[PDB]
Amino acid sequence: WTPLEPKLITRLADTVRTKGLRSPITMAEVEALMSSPLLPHDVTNLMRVILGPAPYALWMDAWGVQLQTVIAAATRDPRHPANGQGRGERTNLDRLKGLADGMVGNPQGQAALLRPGELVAITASALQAFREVARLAEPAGPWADITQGPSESFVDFANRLIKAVEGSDLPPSARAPVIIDCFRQKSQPDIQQLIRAAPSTLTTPGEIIKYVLDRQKIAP
Structure with missing residues (x-):
């Protein structure tokens, strides 16, 4: 390097x-x-x-x-x-x-x-x-152009976003809330409500998804 x-x-x-x-x-x-x-x-x-x-x-x-x-x-x-x-x-x-x-x-x-x-x-x-x-x-925008859709998985998309942020010109801090912020930015109301209803003890591109996925579970 x-x-x-x-x-x-x-x-x-x-x-x-x-x-x-x-x-x-x-x-x-x-x-x-x-x-x-x-x-x-x-x-x-x-x-x-x-x-x-x-x-x-x-x-x-x-x-x-x-x-x-x-x-x-x-x-x-x-x-x-x-x-x-x-x-x-x-x-x-x-x-x-x-x-x-x-x-x-x-x-x-x-x-x-x-x-x-x-x-x-x-x-x-x-x-x-x-x-x-x-x-x-x-x-x-790099991530601004990236929008979570219903056709695309949340995790799959999150990865694309995280990957984008990872390879983006962001400070050593915006690389976490920006990804999550993106989700609560547009995405869907169901997911948005999940993030919004998320705990204030985590705010990283891992726990937020892990929690959402944990919540999503499989009802049907």
Whole structure:
């Protein structure tokens, strides 16, 4: 786990802003730092600094497509650098994500696992996702967009929310009440009433659900 210096990125991003986020210099400056390969996690951290958390999420969406494009591209052209080595290994979105066994929980080891080149793909793909956001401008939320539905399980959804919050720009405290707050934010009245009727002795993304589930039980 190698923490990158945001101060440096901040200075670079500062120039981008001064030059205009919608300006070309952005790609130049961004390409300057990104000139080299990096991790996907840091990519978000970097972009987050360059672009607020609002547009950050938008970058994720574009990043997803950009990443997918690389996967399909590699699939179409058995000569992609993001590929293990040949058309045998073949690149994967998950792999580029770093969820591959041996890569999860290990950034350095993950990069060392991923041949030299795929990183660049992420860097470029990230740059592409950036321009996508620069073009757009929608104040969307990470968890704000996440809403609990009747079609989707409460726990299943809660996981998606928790996972979102976990990978969101929140302080060391908002990562608990925000998730639960989300539930009592919209969700349903039945569930809402459960949370609202919940005890004031617990307020974490675990006991709240555990309690709700404990209450839900199985009448029928």
